[PDB]
Design a protein around this ligand. Structure first.
Ligand code: C5P
Length: 132
């Protein structure tokens, strides 16, 4: 969970389940589908949430990534494509990444997270489980 309230993603997360596997998409891919959003607005980034478990006397919790439209979320002011640890930038070939997406953030319980799905043809990152 989060002990500091997060910026809320419109979408469900993508959880790592195999070590060493890289979170990636093919250029032009990796923007989750939201009804009615034009392709020109399909631009943003996945943000890594590093998770931490507590110590037991048993025997580790891998990161989960969340999507934010460009100009929103915890890296709202960073430039598209810039090398930042824990930020993976994605955009439709139709999007102009110089301009923020004109896309209101989500919440209250005015709207729940949209289950993450990608269009046919999307190369899915092996070793990751899409929540939902
Ligand atoms: N910083 C954030 C932003 C949204 N969320 C949300 O939590 C849900 C995803 O569940 P999991 O974290 O268990 O994958 C979605 O509703 C998603 O938007 C989150 O867990 N951390």
């Amino acid at each position: 969970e989060f002990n500091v309230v997060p910026y809320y993603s419109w979408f469900s997360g993508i959880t790592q389940f195999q070590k060493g596997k890289e979170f990636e998409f093919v250029e032009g891919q990796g923007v989750p589908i939201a009804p009615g959003v034009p392709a020109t607005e399909a631009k943003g980034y996945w943000y890594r949430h590093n998770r931490r478990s507590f110590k037991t006397a048993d025997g580790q919790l891998l990161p989960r990534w969340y999507f934010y439209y460009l100009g929103t979320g915890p890296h709202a002011k960073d430039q598209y494509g810039t090398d930042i640890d824990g930020v993976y930038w994605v955009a439709s070939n139709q999007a102009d990444v110089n301009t923020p997406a004109d896309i209101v953030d989500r919440d209250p319980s005015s709207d729940e997270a949209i289950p993450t799905r990608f269009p046919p043809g999307t190369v899915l990152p092996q070793g990751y489980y899409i929540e939902g």
